[PDB]
Amino acid sequence: DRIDSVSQLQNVAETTKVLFDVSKETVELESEAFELKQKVELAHEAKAVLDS
Amino acid sequence: QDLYLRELKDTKLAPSTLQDAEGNVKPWNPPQKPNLPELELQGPEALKAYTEQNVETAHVAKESEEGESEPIEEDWLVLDDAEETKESH
């Protein structure tokens, strides 16, 4: 039974490193379009005033 | 013929000073000038908001930081809590 328990995570821990790696960027890489959000909302009011 | 020409001429007397020229307006007692080009020129921005969205307030986006760059007091606690979870896992 302990053969299976050890073999459950024989391949997991090293494959979780790239998992832990990429998950960090994919979470904390949302700032570039956050600034684009600032200019996208800047565009809407620019359209809004001229439409007004 | 004349009855059209004279009313065409009439379009060059009564409304000629109205919009064709800027001689105010004779038939009307209220004036035409201090309504649209000065009071209602800001009228479109009297309907919307001024000095905030017509100026448009191009504002710097508020900057958000990371987890205070303080890993040692939380990563090991998370590691200690990871021990707690994996006993329950």
Swiss-Prot record, chain A:
Localization recorded for this chain is: Mitochondrion; Mitochondrion inner membrane
Spell out which residues are annotated as carrying Phosphoserine: 5
Its domain of life reads: Eukaryota
User: What miscellaneous comment appears in this entry?
Assistant: Present with 12900 molecules/cell in log phase SD medium.
Functional description taken from the UniProt entry: Mitochondrial membrane ATP synthase (F(1)F(0) ATP synthase or Complex V) produces ATP from ADP in the presence of a proton gradient across the membrane which is generated by electron transport complexes of the respiratory chain. F-type ATPases consist of two structural domains, F(1) - containing the extramembraneous catalytic core, and F(0) - containing the membrane proton channel, linked together by a central stalk and a peripheral stalk. During catalysis, ATP synthesis in the catalytic domain of F(1) is coupled via a rotary mechanism of the central stalk subunits to proton translocation.
As for family, the record states: Belongs to the eukaryotic ATPase B chain family.
Q: How does it assemble?
A: F-type ATPases have 2 components, CF(1) - the catalytic core - and CF(0) - the membrane proton channel. In yeast, the dimeric form of ATP synthase consists of 17 polypeptides: alpha, beta, gamma, delta, epsilon, 4 (B), 5 (OSCP), 6 (A), 8, 9 (C), d, E (Tim11), f, g, h, i/j and k.
Task: Spell out the protein name for this chain.
Answer: ATP synthase subunit 4, mitochondrial
Q: What is the lineage of its organism?
A: Eukaryota, Fungi, Dikarya, Ascomycota, Saccharomycotina
Q: Which portion of the entire protein is included?
A: 140 to 191 of 244
From Swiss-Prot, chain B:
Annotated compartments: Mitochondrion; Mitochondrion inner membrane
Q: Where is this region: Disordered?
A: 54-89
Acidic residues bias located where? 65-89
Q: Does the keyword Mitochondrion apply?
A: yes
Tell me which GO cellular component terms the UniProt record holds. Answer: mitochondrial inner membrane; mitochondrion; proton-transporting ATP synthase complex
Protein keywords: ATP synthesis, CF(0), Hydrogen ion transport, Ion transport, Membrane, Mitochondrion, Mitochondrion inner membrane, Transit peptide, Transport
Where are its TM segments located?
none
- The reply to whether Hydrolase figures as a keyword in the UniProt entry is no
Q: What biological-process GO terms show up in the record? A: cristae formation; mitochondrial proton-transporting ATP synthase complex assembly; proton motive force-driven ATP synthesis; proton transmembrane transport
Miscellaneous notes = Present with 6140 molecules/cell in log phase SD medium.
Q: How does it assemble?
A: F-type ATPases have 2 components, CF(1) - the catalytic core - and CF(0) - the membrane proton channel. In yeast, the dimeric form of ATP synthase consists of 17 polypeptides: alpha, beta, gamma, delta, epsilon, 4 (B), 5 (OSCP), 6 (A), 8, 9 (C), d, E (Tim11), f, g, h, i/j and k.
Role of this protein: Mitochondrial membrane ATP synthase (F(1)F(0) ATP synthase or Complex V) produces ATP from ADP in the presence of a proton gradient across the membrane which is generated by electron transport complexes of the respiratory chain. F-type ATPases consist of two structural domains, F(1) - containing the extramembraneous catalytic core and F(0) - containing the membrane proton channel, linked together by a central stalk and a peripheral stalk. During catalysis, ATP synthesis in the catalytic domain of F(1) is coupled via a rotary mechanism of the central stalk subunits to proton translocation.
Q: Which family does it belong to?
A: Belongs to the ATPase h subunit family.
Write the protein's name.
ATP synthase subunit H, mitochondrial
Source organism of this protein record: Saccharomyces cerevisiae (strain ATCC 204508 / S288c)
Source lineage: Eukaryota, Fungi, Dikarya, Ascomycota, Saccharomycotina
Mapped onto the parent protein, the portion here is: 36 to 124 of 124
